[PDB]
């Protein structure tokens, strides 16, 4: 989040977070993080869950253009630079970055695409910038109707308002299925009560029941046991296994 370097909304940077203890209060407590919108999860509960995998994306876009960052949206960014899957789960985070990314008729380093030969697939990345073919006129060199270069810049002049001022965006994509998990909040553990009716939270799986030493041979690569109708029949302790 605090890295000085943020990539363009195409060829967007992607960082995998694994084997750590997260603390999302350090994020939404920040003043500049004016926009904090989440789909499939709420800001208050982020610190209580545990995630099987975590991926973070980042890029720079306009202010009003952040509207396009949502599941199944359509637009220049949503279709030709960065597209979220319709069933995306995670949070979208953006904040003002004029103090960094705004320059008088400058800031070319932050780019995007107005049009592309085809709409991007979800989380699809394209490093190339080849010219769109005109079709009606042979075009290997530059040409008219459609052989214009896809990339183009805002120029991020400070005179711009929020409609064109730079916004620094970081998107968290999560898989919220249960263990195996390696990234989640600082929730403290507790001793494991057995043979007594007890409320249990095994790696984010909340429930009420009696815990007994299981006698079914779990293979070493299995981490859960489901009875009929998706009910969790058994679970392995993430500490003593």
């Amino acid at each position: 989040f605090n890295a000085t370097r943020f990539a363009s909304v195409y060829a967007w940077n992607r960082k995998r977070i694994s084997n750590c203890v997260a603390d999302y209060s350090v994020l939404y407590n920040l003043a500049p993080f004016f926009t904090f919108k989440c789909y499939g999860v709420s800001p208050t509960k982020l610190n209580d869950l545990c995630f099987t995998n975590v991926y973070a994306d980042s890029f720079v876009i306009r202010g009003d253009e952040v509207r396009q960052i949502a599941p199944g949206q359509t637009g220049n960014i949503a279709d030709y630079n960065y597209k979220l899957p319709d069933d995306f789960t995670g949070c979208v985070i953006a904040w003002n970055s004029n103090k960094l990314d705004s320059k008088v008729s400058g800031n070319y380093n932050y780019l995007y695409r107005l049009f592309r030969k085809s709409n991007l697939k979800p989380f699809e990345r394209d490093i190339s910038t080849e010219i769109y073919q005109a079709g009606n006129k042979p075009c290997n060199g530059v040409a008219g109707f459609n052989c214009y270069f896809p990339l183009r810049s805002y120029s991020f002049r400070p005179t711009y308002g929020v409609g064109h001022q730079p916004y620094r965006v970081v998107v968290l994509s999560f898989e919220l299925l249960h263990a195996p998990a390696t990234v989640c909040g600082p929730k403290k553990s507790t001793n494991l009560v057995k043979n007594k009716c007890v409320n249990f939270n095994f790696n984010g799986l909340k429930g009420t029941g009696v815990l007994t030493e299981s006698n079914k041979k779990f293979l070493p690569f299995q981490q859960f046991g489901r009875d009929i109708a998706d009910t969790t029949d058994a679970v392995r302790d993430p500490q003593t296994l």
Partner: antibody
Amino acid sequence: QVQLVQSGAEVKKPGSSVKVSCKASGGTFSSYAISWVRQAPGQGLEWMGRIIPIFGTANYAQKFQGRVTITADESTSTAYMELSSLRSEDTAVYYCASLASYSSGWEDVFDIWGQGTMVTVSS
Amino acid sequence: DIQMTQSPSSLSASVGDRVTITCRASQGISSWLAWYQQKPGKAPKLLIYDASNLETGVPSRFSGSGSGTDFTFTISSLQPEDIATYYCQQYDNLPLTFGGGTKVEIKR
């Protein structure tokens, strides 16, 4: 891989315009861009301008607008810098370097550099 | 255009000694700074692209730190290839500006 090779030293009398150029190799022309910097004797560097040939966009430092123009083409895959109305003080070496603020979101600090072209102005 | 000044202008230290360099700016740049080493009259070699990140292939011998209107550049050991002028490159704004350079010569 991308590399730069510059033209030879060019010389002419004061008050004229000096040409300078350097080839674009590696990748191709439309995935490339150039800026030019000055290194006069007994001092540090200085930045003249920048071009992205396929954008048509170019910029020059406050010290060099009007006196400087930039052009490039894909047929020869090279950049064409020109400086006009030279003083005797303009005697310096001019470097063209690969641009980075042309795409995919890294910054404008020059990684690949040319060999340097010497221009000396005298009667 | 925003200027910067390098202080002190000249240094002298023996090979193996720790050396530090600093430069001064009139207005606060938001960490948009880079550092170069140049042999007098030769092509500069790029060292630091982000205020505290070395460039590809740069030895760990080089480093720097600082914030706001000022920054500092230091080396853990003055080595044989070190008689050169060190420039702090400002790129906060479109008009690029370069420092006066700090020169170091072997202390004999």
